[PDB]
């Protein structure tokens, strides 16, 4: 410090150094340790053991199996040298799992299987067979349409509350129009996706297409809802 200066301030305007009034000495001030506490579990179905992670603290303050990672202090897990596919993410490339009796272990994430391609300036690879693959993709379309009555929610049934509220200006009008716009948007979203065809086409009564079986995705007349089996499964699941 300069001889007349008494304490030191930071960029954020927080005191970080001080001068002792008796001995002309400078001291650094450091905040006391704090952090978050998280629990890692394999599910009460699988076991009742847990591990505990203290985030962003040195392992010397938490006073078993103790480990120090860039995420913080880990207690109750055994560190190994293997590498598996990640199961429970911890942070900075560290993952945890429940492995062999049985115990909680920690390890490094494994990116994948190592492979090398025999490259040469003279050789090629040509396939001799093929496979037909079917895959599923799921996409949400719309959400629930809600409406709110502002006066009944705020003032219930009393009257002078409404008299006080109307002094606050036009604040109830802008909420209704936003909610109505959202509802109209949902209705437009459904139409944009599903109403793409002009006419309703029908399958021939004789369902033969050269040996291809489409019964799993075609409508089932027996069911009153007239849905396909896959559609019924999806409907019942949610």
């Amino acid at each position: 410090f300069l001889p007349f200066q008494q304490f030191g301030r930071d960029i954020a305007d927080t005191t970080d150094a001080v001068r002792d009034p008796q001995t002309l000495e400078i001291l650094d001030i450091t905040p006391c340790s704090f952090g978050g506490v998280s629990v890692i579990t394999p599910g009460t179905n699988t076991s009742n053991q847990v591990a505990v992670l203290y985030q962003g603290v040195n392992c010397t303050e938490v006073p078993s199996n103790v480990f120090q990672t860039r995420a913080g202090c880990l207690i109750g897990a055994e560190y190994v040298n293997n590498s598996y596919e990640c199961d429970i993410p911890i942070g900075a490339g560290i993952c945890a799992s429940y492995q062999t009796s049985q115990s909680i272990i920690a390890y490094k994430m494994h990116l994948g299987a190592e492979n090398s391609v025999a490259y040469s300036n003279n050789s090629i690879a040509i396939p001799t067979n093929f496979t037909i693959s079917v895959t599923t993709e799921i996409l949400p379309v719309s959400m629930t349409k809600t409406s709110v009555d502002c006066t009944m929610y705020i003032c219930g049934d009393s009257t002078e509350c409404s008299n006080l509220l109307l002094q606050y200006g036009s604040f109830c009008t802008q909420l209704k129009r936003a909610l109505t716009g959202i509802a109209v948007e949902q209705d437009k979203n459904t139409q944009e996706v599903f109403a793409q065809v002009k006419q309703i086409y029908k399958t021939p009564p004789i369902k033969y297409f050269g040996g291809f079986n489409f019964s799993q995705i075609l409508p089932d007349p027996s069911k009153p809802s007239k849905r396909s089996p896959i559609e019924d499964l999806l409907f019942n699941k949610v």
Partner: protein
């Protein structure tokens, strides 16, 4: 015939379909038979749709819970404040409750607006996928499933859509020796739509996605220049059909 069109669309000749029709139909039936088991076995697969519902429900509960809150006032119940207290001191309590209950509504509306924007983006993507994967065959990589896209099927679900993508995957590959061009009579020859491969003793020309060797012929290749500029040219013979 439509399926043959679709094989042509990805660079495979028509005869490959017509000579393997039964096997391909069996493979398609077996693949479509496992969709129900794959969906039912893992409940988390549909969780995304479920997720949306949960979010909405949660919001409503929060909007109720702010009602039973004092918000720094004497009590949450308003009628008791009316009954017990005098008009001077009642007004400040009423105003406090009014402001506290108005902020809660404002926050809810803002969250709803943000979620609506996200849902709109998802719906736009779904409409694009319906336009390009179901009403046509797409050349974009990984847009309609994984592999060489053949076709797709839509199915409906509560607040959502499910696409089944049918694609083609190569398998059982072998290794061969190649050459960029073939020199026959001081002239360079190049394949018209295939590639030159060698069995170790003989040379053939084949399509690039399915092994089907054929004899090099003047109607399989075209001539361009001498045998000096090309690096890696290989001596061989080219058969001429006109042999009367």
């Amino acid at each position: 015939m439509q399926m043959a069109y679709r094989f042509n669309g990805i660079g495979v000749t028509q005869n490959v379909l017509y000579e393997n029709q039964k096997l391909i139909a069996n493979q398609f039936n077996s693949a479509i038979g496992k969709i129900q088991d794959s969906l039912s076995s893992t409940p988390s697969a549909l969780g995304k749709l479920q997720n949306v519902v949960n979010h909405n429900a949660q919001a409503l509960n929060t909007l109720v819970k702010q009602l039973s809150s004092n918000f720094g006032a004497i009590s949450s119940v308003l009628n008791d404040i009316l009954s017990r207290l005098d008009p001077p001191e009642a007004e400040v309590q009423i105003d406090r409750l009014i402001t506290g209950r108005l902020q809660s509504l404002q926050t809810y509306v803002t969250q709803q607006l943000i979620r609506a924007a996200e849902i709109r983006a998802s719906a736009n993507l779904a409409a694009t996928k319906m336009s390009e994967c179901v009403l046509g065959q797409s050349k974009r990589v990984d847009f309609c499933g994984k592999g060489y896209h053949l076709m797709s099927f839509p199915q409906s679900a509560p607040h959502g859509v499910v696409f089944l993508h049918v694609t083609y995957v190569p398998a059982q590959e072998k290794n061969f020796t190649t050459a960029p061009a073939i020199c026959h009579d001081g002239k360079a020859h190049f394949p018209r739509e295939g590639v030159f491969v060698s069995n170790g003793t003989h040379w053939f020309v084949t399509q690039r996605n399915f092994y089907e060797p054929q004899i090099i012929t003047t109607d399989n290749t075209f001539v361009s220049g001498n045998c000096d500029v090309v690096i890696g040219i290989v001596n061989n013979t080219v058969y001429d059909p006109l042999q009367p």
